[PDB]
């Protein structure tokens, strides 16, 4: 109740997203089931935390009180506790709630009821667990509507838990686009601001099946002095926003898809990491073992070069 967010940002440090798992409709549908040993592997390689994308919306009733289903809550307990056991900090969020993005009015009560339940569930867990409000707000959930939503969410959470650091993202899909429009209530002072970074989007997502028209970006490379300047400019913008609004920064997701040439990916990833570190930002790579992966779960081997870029 006198906790520091910048310190909590230090505790986050370097992390990795365990994606295409709990944020799919059912765990495993997208290729990944979170095994307990992943936490050993991740801690052993040097990471300080894991970010866990969770699709609470498909595992909660659609009518008041929007109760989260017992079996699912039990599964999330098990994942969080498995990470904590290895000494890893943990970031959990609400992920892929598409109905909310498309109709924020109709789904507002359900979304806040999810947080009421989650805060209640974990209010007494370690201070190394972080609550990330909503992954990539977008579409009809405009930057203005997001500022209202996030303040309601902080109110719901803080009425229950005044200990855990809350992580707040940006609208327009959570990148830099809407950063200037973000308003974090002056009254809330234990929050970290999160930005996802995938620019040049065409490079990072080239050939992504889930992005319309991405097959036209296939073959794009990255690495020129030109490229580097463009990125620093964008990070300085974040940094200056950060200094002005006095909020720590967490780059909760960043990565380049497997269809991008390997060397460009390694150059883009190592550069992004060094620049984030110079600005003393925490970060989480997207993602552990799937389409943007750095670890092969079958052979149990890392992509050395990519891991090194991360460290």
Ligand X SMILES: OC[C@H]1O[C@@H](O[C@H]2[C@H](O)[C@@H](O)[C@H](O[C@H]3[C@H](O)[C@@H](O)[C@H](O[C@H]4[C@H](O)[C@@H](O)[C@@H](O)O[C@@H]4CO)O[C@@H]3CO)O[C@@H]2CO)[C@H](O)[C@@H](O)[C@@H]1O
Binder of ligand X out of 187, 210, 226, 299 (CB under 6 A): 210
Residue 293 lies near ligand X (rule: CB under 6 A): no
From the CB of 93, what's the least distance to ligand X, in Å? 9
Of 198 and 235, which has the nearer Cβ to ligand X? 198
From the CB of 31, what's the least distance to ligand X, in Å? 5
- The Cα–Cα gap between 72 and 298 comes to 26
Residue 196 lies near ligand X (rule: CB under 6 A): yes
- The Cα–Cα gap between 79 and 93 comes to 13
- The Cα–Cα gap between 282 and 6 comes to 10
CA of 157: how far to CAs of 37, 120, 133, 175, 229, in Å?
A: 31, 8, 10, 24, 40
Of 213 and 225, which has the nearer Cβ to ligand X? 213
Tell how strand 49-52 and strand 249-254 pair up: unpaired
- What string marks each residue from 144 to 183 as x (binds ligand X by CB under 6 A) or -? ----------------------------------------
Residue 242 lies near ligand X (rule: CB under 6 A): no
Residues with Cβ < 8 Å from 47, sequence gap 6 or more? 14, 15, 16, 88
Residue 206 lies near ligand X (rule: CB under 6 A): no
CA of 13: how far to CAs of 7, 185, 282, in Å?
A: 10, 25, 4
Strand-pairing partners, residue 20, are: none
- What string marks each residue from 23 to 62 as x (binds ligand X by CB under 6 A) or -? ------xxx-------------------------------
From the list 77, 75, 95, the residue with the least C-alpha distance to 85 is: 77
Residue 302 lies near ligand X (rule: CB under 6 A): no
Of 117 and 290, which has the nearer Cβ to ligand X? 290
Return residues touching ligand X (CB under 6 A): 19-20, 29-31, 135-136, 196, 210, 253, 286, 290-292
């Amino acid at each position: 109740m006198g906790v520091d967010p910048f310190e909590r940002n230090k505790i986050l440090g370097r992390g990795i997203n365990i994606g295409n798992a709990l944020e799919a409709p059912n765990e495993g549908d997208w290729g990944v089931v979170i095994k307990d040993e992943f936490f050993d592997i991740i801690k052993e390689a040097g990471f300080s935390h894991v970010r866990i994308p969770i699709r609470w919306s498909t595992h909660a009733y659609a009518f008041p009180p929007y109760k989260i289903m017992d079996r699912f809550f039990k599964r999330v307990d098990e994942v969080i506790n498995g990470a904590l056991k290895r000494g890893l900090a943990v970031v959990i969020n609400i992920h892929h709630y598409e109905e909310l993005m498309n109709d924020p009015e109709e789904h507002k009560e359900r979304f806040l009821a999810l947080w009421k339940q989650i805060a209640d569930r974990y209010k007494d867990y370690p201070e190394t667990l972080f609550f990330e409000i909503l992954n990539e707000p977008h579409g009809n959930l405009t930057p203005e509507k997001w500022n209202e939503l996030l303040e309601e969410a902080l109110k719901v959470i803080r009425s229950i838990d005044k200990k855990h650091t809350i992580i707040i993202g940006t609208a327009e899909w959570g990148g830099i686009s809407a950063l200037e429009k973000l308003s974090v209530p002056k009254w809330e002072k234990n929050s970290i601001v999160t930005i996802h970074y995938y620019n040049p989007f065409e490079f990072t997502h080239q050939g992504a099946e889930w992005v319309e028209g991405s097959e036209k970006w296939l073959g794009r490379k990255w690495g020129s002095p030109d490229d580097q300047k463009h990125l620093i400019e964008e990070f300085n913008f974040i940094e200056e926003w950060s200094k002005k609004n006095k909020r720590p920064i967490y780059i909760g997701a960043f990565g380049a898809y497997r269809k991008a040439d390997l060397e460009s990916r390694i150059k883009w990833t190592s550069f992004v990491v060094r620049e984030m570190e110079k600005r003393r930002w925490s970060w989480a790579y997207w993602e552990f073992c799937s389409g943007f992966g750095v670890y092969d779960t079958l052979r149990k081997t890392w992509n050395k070069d990519l891991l090194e870029a991360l460290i």
